[PDB]
Every structure is written in C-alpha cells, then in structure tokens.
Amino acid sequence: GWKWEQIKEIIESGELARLKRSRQMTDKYHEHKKRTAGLDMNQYVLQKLGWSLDEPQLENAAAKAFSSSTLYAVRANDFPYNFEPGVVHLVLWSKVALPVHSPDKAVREAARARMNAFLQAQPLLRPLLSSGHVAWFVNYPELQSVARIFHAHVLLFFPRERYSAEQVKTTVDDILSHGFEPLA
Ligand SMILES: [Zn+2]
C-alpha cells in the first residue's frame, strides 16, 4: 500500500485516481456492488444517517457546514483503499456540501479552508495533526459514488512504531463513538 508521504504527494498533485483499493479489497467491493446494484445509494445513505425528509428538522436551512453535530457523520470506510499499515480510512459525510473542486478558485479555496478548520479544531486528532498525520480528499465526479451527499475521505496515520494495532483500534473506536465536535 501507499506510504504516508506518497499519499500526501498524490493528494497534493490531485492525482486522486491513483488512490486505489488492493486487488482483494477490489474483489470485496465488487461483491458489495453486486448487492447494492438495485438501490439508489444516495437515498440509502440518507436513510442510514437519519437525514431523509421523513425525519424531523433540527435545521435552520442556512446552517454552516459542521456548525452542528447533526449536520455531519464520521464512519469507518468498509472498503478502505490500499494504504500502508497504520493508515486508517474514514469517511466524513456532510449534509451541507462543500464545493472543494469548484472552477472558481475563490470558492474552491474557501471550501477547502472550511474543511481544514473543521479537522484542525478536533481535540481527538490533536497529536496526529501535530505530526502531519491527518489528510483528506474528496473524490472528483468521475470517481465518486453517492454524488448527492458530500463525503470526504479522512485519513489518519498511526505509525506502527508509535501505536500498537490495538491502540489504533481503541483510538478510532473512541473517535467514531464520540464523533467530531462542531465548529461555529
Ligand atoms: Zn453521528
């Protein structure tokens, strides 16, 4: 799998298609694809996250992305990409889209700045941020699924010489249980 420095270089160059699953994980992803071939996965995800129109509305319509914990959700990626041991592949879903690949440089930079501020503000990521061991990307339209719901790939690096696999499990379970904290 990709080493952390390679991951950072790929994200920086925008060559996101290079971030691929292993042959085997590609096989499993293929079988899950067979299973969901009869579904609109946008509606499925909305349903699972509690964001369907059926649900109540703790909204103000104009709420800023990440301004309230009801507006986002972090999950472990069930079919992670092929990264070196210690890299944890999470998915951050947001009810509010962030136009991070807009042709408008002002809009794109502003949307990226918001995502960055959100992740930087997270106490549960503090030592990883201090280490440069948090990265994120949003797959382009020609690469993504579930295009009606914003989601970012959030990668956390726990080097093997710094965290046992069991300590990684513990910390990630902690993050997913607590969730991320909102940002005004
Ligand atoms: Zn949640």
Numbering used by the authors: 16 to 199
From the paper:
We chose YPL067C, a yeast protein with no significant sequence similarity to any structure in the Protein Data Bank (PDB) as the target for our competition. In addition, YPL067C was chosen for its biological interest, as previous studies suggested that YPL067C is involved in preventing amyloid toxicity. Despite the lack of sequence homology to any protein in the PDB, a DALI16 search of YPL067C found that it is structurally similar to members of the widely conserved superfamily of histidine triad (HIT) proteins. YPL067C's characterization makes it the founding member of a new family we are calling HTC (for histidine triad with channel), with YPL067C being the first member, HTC1.
